[PDB]
């Protein structure tokens, strides 16, 4: 396992988390050089693109890496001031904190009871760090990973709402070219990535 | 009146935690502003339906933009004691080409640092062990002994004071870097824009816990 590995990762991934992962990877494989770009471009000479599902027709070779379960939450202060929405249709009268890029719409798919609803777009940002802080700071309703916020849920700083209409889990994949189907550095990296996001101190985002 | 929407573009290398704290404070002061904040390294427009503000590192190179200096930092070259104990300490810039560097950069950034005794800087190359567009990852990898890194002496104050990072080549410093908020001249109505940029400086400069973030 050697050579160079150029990897694209959405801006919504935690840079702290990916840093810890790449450190452990390089410790195991000392002869690999890394070029990691946090970017929201739809992938430019990349060996691996990390992507959220669903995969597109251009994604001809891919590996499922992990899944996460989002949940809708707000702070108790927000719910005291604005009320607790009783059904998804009431989200239209509520402030939401949208995780998205410059063409992402303030629409959330809820239920399985399956429906798509809008909300007042108080903030749009492509940073989960900022989404979480703004939710804690009483600004409105946010979709957060149930694993990313277990402490805040346990201590009541975030409150789950509309639990009768759960969201579909999201899946994360690694996409790579069939030209590199035999590449040992790609396989080594994705194996290490899967082990971290499945059994580790890394299940925090 | 400060109200309506503000759209802000920010480099991917910029602290998301710092921006989150400042945006929370801004919206608590101005409850009628809706924010659209995008961390991006793409070229973005500053007119019409494009962005209202871009946060940009120096140098400024464009007329038709107005700029407000948000803060300035002094980068220094550092490595961990563990790195230096095994690879040796470079004595001159010429020796850096034999050393591992952790490069902060995007897809066209070269593995060079401009170093110089005085104002005149010269390109100094290193082995590109890592390139990444994240100061957080750069710092962690330097702390974990993977190579030499350019780091802000503010972001790394604690690690320098206690020895987990060690400055090198101190006789060939780098230029400071400067962080601006920029907006279009061809765009007037800068009530919300000026309110944001001046709140940024007022809150950043009075909160020590924020100054450590970059």
Numbering used by the authors:
A (entry chain B): 90 to 132, 137 to 205, 208 to 300
B (entry chain A): 89 to 302
Original paper wording:
Here, we describe the discovery of a LysR type transcriptional regulator (LTTR), AccR (for ACCase regulator) in S. oneidensis, which directly and specifically activates transcription of the accS gene as a canonical LTTR. We showed that AccR interacts with the accS promoter in vivo in response to changes in acetyl-CoA levels and in vitro. Multiple lines of evidence indicate that acetyl-CoA is one of the effectors.
EBD crystals were rod-shaped, belonging to the space group C2. The final structural model of AccR EBD contains residues 89–302 for subunit A and residues 90–300 for the subunit B, except for residues 132–136 and 206–207 in two surface loops of the subunit B that are structurally disordered. Superimposition of the two EBD subunits in a dimer gave an overall r.m.s.d. of 0.25 Å for 204 common Cα atoms, suggesting nearly identical conformation. In the AccR EBD dimer, ∼3200 Å2 of surface area is buried at the dimer interface, which is mostly mediated by α5, β4 with α7 and β10 from the adjacent subunit, suggesting stable molecular interactions. Structural comparison indicates that AccR EBD has a large, ‘primary’ funnel-shaped ligand binding pocket within a monomer. In addition, another ‘secondary’ pocket is found at the regulatory domain dimerization interface and contains S103 and E105 from both chains of the dimer. However, this secondary pocket found in AccR may not interact with acetyl-CoA because it is a negatively charged cavity as seen by the surface charge representation, and acetyl-CoA is also negatively charged.
